[PDB]
């Protein structure tokens, strides 16, 4: 699917991004660059994938200059840039849950900084590099959420940030189609990662107990591989005419708990 | 191979998008692909070309629920299962006034609604019932939709209403059949060169670009039946094991209808 | 007064939401309200109660396009105008197996689709033709829809499909009739205590609260037919002069269907 | 009865444009008191004096400063004895030669647009809700001004598009969380209203609007006015909308696509 492509995975040191980097390489990616802020964790992932197929770059995506450097380093080292997986994202793990009435505006600022400013800087810098290189069939994919299209009972800062990511995806797909660049998102429900266990979901039983009643599809558990497979489809020529689309991977979510 | 060992029915498989999907499903390793359709000899030609040991042709007017029952049951006992139902058959009216609201021909409305909604509903029902009987694991039902399932049209109002209805069927069936591990999704392509769009006036890739090009964000690629079949194959495979109730839009970033 | 001097037709006005809309339209100053229904005894009682100088009954099965045309003609001729068409009549199956996909009764599907999609389309068409013919300024066409026009259902799959189709009609009619200054919108209420919901087993406010209370964000108020009528009167008035193609949802923040 | 009889309303950004007209229309619909919160002191006191000092007051309030929002909300509730309507209407767009396209996104201008439109709006919803809960307000209403660009992408002003998407996420979440208190939260999404903001974008006259947007607008024979937007807001703020929450009320004349 991805033979000969060069991909960057922000947040690739952990969770969904880690699995996505592994799966992109299994799909024949020429090179996968993990861009994260967890240097030793990230280097670990890179060697696990294979030090000759995967590299790590320290990159705080909220700092546009660090994004530009990571993008430039990637294109120079590997001679191209075909896939930007804008995946890094954070939540506030606030004791009072970031409800509207208890909204911690300082914690709100942190979430919006990473999830909207960082994602926007990543889309911008990746687009600029693909255009400069004349990349053909380039793909930019943002990790979203069902909370990009419906409200939350908690984590209001996160909900607003993912709504904003969807607006960015829609706008970028409109503006970058002229260059043949496709911009899409993938919105998974609950994946066991370090993020979801900070919310109190550590085991598949925790997931089913929290969400199963609200999930239409029975008899299958959502894995990080599932999310990576959706993203590899979007990045591949199997999706050559798909842009501006939010690919939802949620088992028919009826509502949040 | 993503469809290895699966048994697929493709309605409307004698022509256009359905024909390509049947070929592409077989190329992705489907054990058997059954074309259900009403163009008897165009369809036998296709199953012939795909490989008479991989592909059969069944006469099936999808509006008739007993013919859908029969086609589904024939497929399952012949090949020992049913894993994928690609509910793709569908029509438009091709009317002098264009089926604007002002000039809606109620009789032609009835014909479009009969195939596109009653027939699609019959296929989803009969395919689902058989999957549950056989105990199919990870079954997939996929309906061909349209950007006109989520937006209004300037013309072909009956077709627009029918595709809106198909989307409601997909959403409802996903919530009801998830208990059986059956996933239900749709694929919504924009303009594919088929006999249907030829009846509309689009014969050549240059016609498509002249009618839809300025309304499409993505430049440098034309949509093909293969693209739609690849979207469906993805949805039918384990690559989409947790995707249900979803409308997979393949429109190049359609800004608006012309 | 919001609707001062306007002539309105309310289909399904003999009962439930339509009856309350007819009364509320008159309270907002409508010059004439015409109730179009198939329950003549009930409908004549509503018309007489609103006021025989202000309100008339016409027998009209909206699934028969000729009866619709006749009712619209009679309204414009009797009252010299047509400003508001509230296409509100609709039905459900009330089947013992709930019209799930697995147990979908196609003949009952046909009945629901006939009233809710074919009939609604004929009403939109015939009202639009008449307002265009009269030169109506700022005419309004409103269809009663449902949260099930935008999400799937666990039951009543035929009704879900039909209300999706109604939204496709509203969107299409909005884009085609705006050239004439005609606005087309829908209103989508959740559970109102009417003969329709009584037939689904909801007879009392406690029944509604038990079925839907914990799926509804908004507490302290129960949806009434008057709430729905006020939404329709807003959309029908100059308070909504630039609103078209819109589905006005009146559901209390519905988290999910039961 | 007047649609807003007896209600106390706050209108942020009420010194100008849509918010000024909303303040006038709310008073016209019988609001007991309208408080204009803005950062244009002389303009805002003009509006308040014009509506009538007995029924309208002005407060200086930078909505991106949560403390000033809380202070304006407390002053309203203490002065007038209640808080029934919060119309979170203040917002900005960037001054950008490059249009804030993705390719030329000025990140520091993006920051400012997000700070006012998302951080400020969130603070306004929070502080208004906290007060209505404290007061035991019955049938309270919080309305945010949104845009078609809350639900569709834009060719330009990408920062603004993301900010309005985020506002809709706030409206949806607040609706879900505040319904327990009887508080309804909705948005109103107008297309092109002639204001100082759209003049800055190059739309100064009705002909400008028609030339830029007429062929993309289904509804003919009428042009969107600020009064139309205010009437939609007044509806949502009233008992005519007693069961409407979490809803985006679109006022765009059937917009077929963005320019
Ligand atoms: N896990 C879920 O269930 C779930 C569901 C829906 C959406 N998501 C989203 O998927 C993305 C990945 O989430 P995850 O579950 O793998 O969480 P995770 O915490 O396991 O991984 C996130 C990684 O992003 C990195 N990160 C944080 N800030 C960064 C920054 N400024 N610059 C660069 N990297 C940064 C982190 O170091 C981390 O390695 C996130 O956008 C999340 O919002 C997750
Ligand atoms: N061509 C496009 O650009 C386009 C765009 C959007 C959606 N679609 C939809 O994709 C589906 C296939 O369209 P197509 O372009 O391949 O058109 P097509 O006419 O070339 O193929 C349709 C086939 O379905 C068969 N058919 C019609 N009624 C039938 C019935 N009752 N029972 C069984 N078969 C019946 C027809 O014989 C035909 O072989 C349709 O549902 C169409 O609405 C097509
Ligand atoms: N909770 C609710 O009541 C609810 C919720 C959502 C949507 N709706 C929709 O609101 C509309 C009215 O529903 P209601 O609850 O008032 O039901 P109701 O049964 O109380 O009233 C419906 C009236 O429509 C008339 N009707 C049926 N078929 C007709 C036909 N062919 N021609 C003319 N009239 C016909 C009926 O005789 C009846 O008087 C319907 O479209 C319904 O789908 C109702
Ligand atoms: N005019 C349009 O076409 C249009 C369309 C859709 C949405 N909107 C939105 O409507 C809102 C009002 O826009 P408008 O056209 O009336 O513009 P406007 O500039 O005429 O009025 C906005 C007023 O908000 C005040 N404002 C800005 N930042 C503020 C802050 N931090 N604190 C307090 N007040 C502040 C401003 O001084 C100004 O008086 C905005 O949210 C805009 O996004 C406008």
Residue numbers in the entry:
A (entry chain D): 24 to 280
B (entry chain C), C (entry chain B): 23 to 280
D (entry chain A): 22 to 280
Provide the authors' original text about this structure.
1 is then reduced by the enzyme iridoid synthase (ISY), which generates a reactive intermediate 8-oxocitronellyl enol 2 that is primed to cyclize to form the canonical nepetalactol 3 scaffold, the precursor to all iridoids in plants. The stereochemistry of the bridgehead carbons (C4a and C7a) are set during the subsequent cyclization of 8-oxocitronellyl enol 2, the ISY product, to form 3. Some NEPS, although containing an NAD+ binding site, are redox inactive and catalyze only cyclization, others catalyze only the oxidation from nepetalactol to nepetalactone, while others are dual-function enzymes, catalyzing both stereo-selective cyclization and oxidation of various nepetalactols to nepetalactones. Here, we set out to understand and expand the selectivity of NEPS by both gene discovery in Nepeta sibirica and enzyme engineering of NEPS from various Nepeta species: N. sibirica, N. cataria and N. mussinii.
We identified, characterized and subjected to crystallography analysis the NEPS orthologue NsNEPS2 as a 7S-cis-trans nepetalactone 4a synthase. Biochemical assays showed that NsNEPS2 (N. sibirica) is a cis-trans cyclase and oxidase; when NsNEPS2 is incubated with 8-oxogeranial 1 and 7S-ISY, 7S-cis-trans nepetalactone 4a, with no presence of iridodial 5 byproducts, is observed. Since NEPS belong to the NAD+-dependent short chain dehydrogenase family, mutation of the active site tyrosine residue required for oxidation in this class of enzymes could be a straightforward way to decouple cyclization and oxidative activity. Mutation of the active site tyrosine in NsNEPS2 (NsNEPS2-Y167F) yielded an enzyme that produces only 7S-cis-trans nepetalactol 3a, with no iridodial 5 byproducts, suggesting that cyclization activity was maintained while oxidation activity was eliminated. NsNEPS2, 7S-cis-trans nepetalactone 4a synthase when assayed with 7S-ISY, yielded 7R-cis-trans nepetalactone 4a’ when assayed with 7R-ISY. Correspondingly, NsNEPS2-Y167F yielded 7R-cis-trans nepetalactol 3a’. In summary, the active site of NsNEPS2 can accommodate formation of both enantiomers, 7R-cis-trans 4a and 7S-cis-trans 4a’ which have two unique 4a-7a bridge configurations (4aR,7aS vs. 4aS,7aR, respectively). NsNEPS2 is able to catalyze cyclization of enantiomers yielding cis-trans stereochemistry for both 7 S and 7 R ISY. Enzyme assays with 8-oxogeranial and NsISY show that NsNEPS1A, NsNEPS1B, NsNEPS2 and NsNEPSL all oxidize 7S-cis-trans nepetalactol 3a to 7S-cis-trans nepetalactone 4a. Based on the available NEPS crystal structures (NmNEPS3 and NsNEPS2), we hypothesized that the relatively bulky L199 residue in NmNEPS4 prevents the orientation of the 3c relative to the NAD+ cofactor required for oxidation.
